[PDB]
């Protein structure tokens, strides 16, 4: 905890030291200002002598001290703010890397709102409570120490009087401040309860009107708001008492401090300037107390934010993200098998997902699953989740030992409703390739021509640089699926995993989709998951899944003449 907070400021060792030096300089040459003002006043009022040549020099000299204080304050502010920024940036980048490196299963139990809030709000608190708050704390502490210590040096007898009435009175103020707060909380609770009755009923005007009971709601609300009104009166009385007592006490305390200082004769006589210095120091101490209180509150909030931020950066990923082996050397075309895998979602272990599999995929096949949960094979083949009780083999060797990046690069998937990123079409297509920057302009046009997407990609109102997304230029479903079809062609997937929408679409544009969605059967091992009979009659195997198991694993001819039907 506290040991790790020192680590954050370790990159900034030289910047922060200068800030503390300039802070202490400013405090020193700012708490010796009341002392000189007393001398200046005594030059002209306690005994005027015969005060025009011994006054210009003093003011002219003190102006220089004021200038130095201003410069020191400026430099301190600049250094502290820059250090805060340069710590917050590092925290933000490291937190984003740690979050993005984690496994998929973590995002199921954690909402995006919490992660975004940690990414923006809490980092500001953790970067401000280690540099831009300790300066204020140190300044407040120095102010209080120098103020109280030097207040005894001017008049000890009057300093023991100001520490016998101010302390006990301020104790009552803290006690009296909680009564008003609890009364206000009570009134606010009653108002919230009354409002919760007026939001439900407006939400159900249809049912409150069928029976004809509408006025009765008006009297119920009237009674509730009257009850809220009566409790609010008891708050006003206490507030009036507080205001009167606080004004009277302050005025009488100042008058009593002033009055006593004129009756001290002989032993400790107070010239005009010394009284002014005394009063200034009292004010300074009064400010410093509130400074300390604010510092403590801010420090506690900062520790609260740090408690949550100090966790994601130190969490081990559940499954390996790198450090694998790539066999390559060709001799690999979609030859994968299953060994009766059993697993449910890690998010929900209640209902089973896959209880049995005996499915095999050969080279140059258009094998097609069918049934009624069958879409989760997509998740398994790309190594996002992990089998619980089973084994997936790819050309003898299993997919566990392989490096996930190369495996996910070779396997390419196409769906019906694809997520579209907020960028130009000239980039989204390049997103498939290994290097999105190293793409020629004509390659995008050629790929659009292959997928027949030039009808809209070239002819935008903003051209190729159109921002595509849910906002602004809304692309149609057919076009936004044709762009996805064109996306995967650049990475040359040896295994293609299509998908079928249950809801039908317009047949006017169906020719282009039928020329890209299932016309990509260019010798690639394809596991089409569809329901149309055309794919069933235009493929090798039509294996059927039902009740979490594989029943039929024959070609189309064998399954064509079912024993029952």
Curated annotation (Swiss-Prot):
Changing residue 315 to T: In a breast cancer sample; somatic mutation. Biliverdin IXalpha binds at residue 246. The modification S-glutathionyl cysteine is found at residue 423. Mg(2+) binds at residues 375, 499. The chain crosses the membrane at residues 14-37, 58-80, 132-154, 158-177, 237-260, 275-296. Its EC number is 7.6.2.-. It is an enzyme of class 7 (translocase). Residues 336-565 form the ABC transporter domain. Keywords: Acetylation, ATP-binding, Glutathionylation, Magnesium, Membrane, Metal-binding, Mitochondrion, Mitochondrion inner membrane, Nucleotide-binding, Transit peptide, Translocase, Transmembrane, Transmembrane helix, Transport. GO terms for biological process: erythrocyte development; export from the mitochondrion; heme biosynthetic process; mitochondrial transport; mitochondrial unfolded protein response; positive regulation of erythrocyte differentiation; positive regulation of heme biosynthetic process; positive regulation of hemoglobin biosynthetic process. Its main location: mitochondrion. Cholesterol promotes the ATPase activity of ABCB10 in a dose-dependent manner. Residues 81-131, 178-236, 297-565 are mitochondrial matrix. It is found in: Mitochondrion inner membrane. ATP binds at residues 373-376. It is a multi-pass membrane protein. GO terms for molecular function: ABC-type transporter activity; ATP binding; ATP hydrolysis activity; metal ion binding; protein homodimerization activity. ATP-dependent transporter located in the mitochondrial inner membrane that catalyzes the export of biliverdin from the mitochondrial matrix, and plays a crucial role in hemoglobin synthesis and antioxidative stress. Participates in the early step of the heme biosynthetic process during insertion of iron into protoporphyrin IX (PPIX). Involved in the stabilization of the iron transporter mitoferrin-1/SLC25A37. In addition may be involved in mitochondrial unfolded protein response (UPRmt) signaling pathway, although ABCB10 probably does not participate in peptide export from mitochondria. Belongs to the ABC transporter superfamily. ABCB family. Mitochondrial peptide exporter (TC 3.A.1.212) subfamily. Homodimer or homooligomer. Interacts with PAAT; this interaction regulates ABCB10. Interacts with SLC25A37; this interaction stabilizes SLC25A37 and enhances the function of SLC25A37 to import mitochondrial iron during erythroid differentiation. Interacts with FECH; this interaction may allow the formation of an oligomeric complex with SLC25A37. Forms a complex with ABCB7 and FECH, where a dimeric FECH bridges ABCB7 and ABCB10 homodimers; this complex may be required for cellular iron homeostasis, mitochondrial function and heme biosynthesis. This is ATP-binding cassette sub-family B member 10, mitochondrial. The lineage of its organism: Eukaryota, Metazoa, Chordata, Craniata, Vertebrata.
């Amino acid at each position: 905890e506290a040991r790790k907070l020192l680590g954050l400021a370790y990159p900034e060792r030289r910047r922060l030291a200068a800030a503390v030096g300039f802070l202490t300089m400013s405090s020193v040459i700012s708490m010796s200002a009341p002392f000189f003002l007393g001398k200046i006043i005594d030059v002209i009022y306690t005994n005027p002598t015969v005060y025009s040549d011994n006054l210009t020099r003093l003011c002219l000299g003190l102006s220089a001290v004021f200038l130095c204080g201003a410069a020191a304050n400026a430099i301190r502010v600049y250094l502290m703010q820059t250090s805060g920024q340069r710590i917050v940036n590092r925290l933000r980048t490291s937190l984003f890397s740690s979050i993005l490196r984690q496994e998929v299963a973590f995002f199921d139990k954690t909402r995006t709102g919490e992660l975004i809030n940690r990414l923006s709000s809490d980092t500001a608190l953790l970067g401000r409570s280690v540099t831009e708050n300790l300066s204020d704390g140190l300044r407040a502490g120095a102010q209080a120490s120098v103020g109280i210590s030097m207040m005894f040096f001017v008049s000890p007898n009057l300093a023991t009087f100001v520490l016998s009435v101010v302390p006990p009175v301020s104790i009552i103020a803290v006690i009296y401040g909680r009564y008003l707060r609890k009364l206000t909380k009570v009134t606010q609770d009653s108002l919230a309860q009354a409002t919760q009755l007026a939001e439900e009923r407006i939400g159900n005007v249809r049912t409150v009107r069928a029976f004809g009971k509408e006025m009765t709601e008006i009297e119920k609300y009237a009674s509730k708001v009257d009850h809220v009104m009566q409790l609010a009166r008891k708050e006003a009385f206490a507030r009036a008492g507080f205001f009167g007592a606080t004004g009277l006490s302050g005025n009488l305390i100042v008058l009593s401090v002033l009055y006593k200082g004129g009756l001290l004769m002989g032993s400790a006589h107070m010239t005009v300037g010394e009284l002014s210095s005394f009063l200034m120091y009292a004010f300074w101490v009064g400010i410093s107390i509130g400074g300390l209180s604010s510092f403590y509150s801010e420090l506690m909030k900062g520790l609260g934010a740090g408690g949550r931020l100090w966790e994601l950066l130190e969490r081990e990923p559940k499954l390996p993200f790198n450090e694998g082996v790539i066999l390559n050397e060709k001799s690999f075309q979609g030859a994968l098998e299953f060994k009766n895998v059993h697993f449910a979602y890690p998010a929900r272990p209640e209902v089973p997902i896959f209880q049995d599999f005996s499915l095999s995929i050969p080279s140059g096949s258009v094998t097609a699953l069918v049934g009624p949960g069958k879409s989760t094979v997509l998740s398994l083949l790309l190594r996002l989740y992990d089998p619980a009780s089973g084994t997936i083999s790819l050309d003898g060797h299993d997919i566990r030992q392989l490096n996930p990046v190369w495996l996910r690069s070779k396997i390419g998937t196409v769906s019906q409703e694809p997520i579209l990123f907020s960028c130009s079409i000239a980039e989204n297509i390049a997103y498939g390739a290994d290097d999105p920057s190293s793409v020629t302009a004509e390659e995008i046009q050629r790929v659009a021509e292959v997928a027949n997407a030039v009808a809209f990609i070239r002819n935008f109102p903003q051209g190729f640089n159109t921002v595509v997304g849910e906002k602004g230029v809304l692309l149609s479903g057919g076009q936004k699926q044709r762009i996805a079809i064109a996306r995967a062609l650049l990475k040359n997937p040896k295994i293609l995993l299509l998908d079928q929408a249950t809801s039908a679409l317009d047949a006017e544009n169906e020719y282009l989709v039928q020329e890209a969605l299932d016309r990509l059967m260019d010798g690639r091992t394809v596991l089409v998951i569809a329901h149309r009979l055309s794919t069933i009659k235009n493929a090798n195997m039509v294996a059927v899944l039902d009740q979490g198991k594989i029943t039929e694993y024959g070609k189309h001819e064998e399954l064509l003449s079912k024993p029952n039907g």
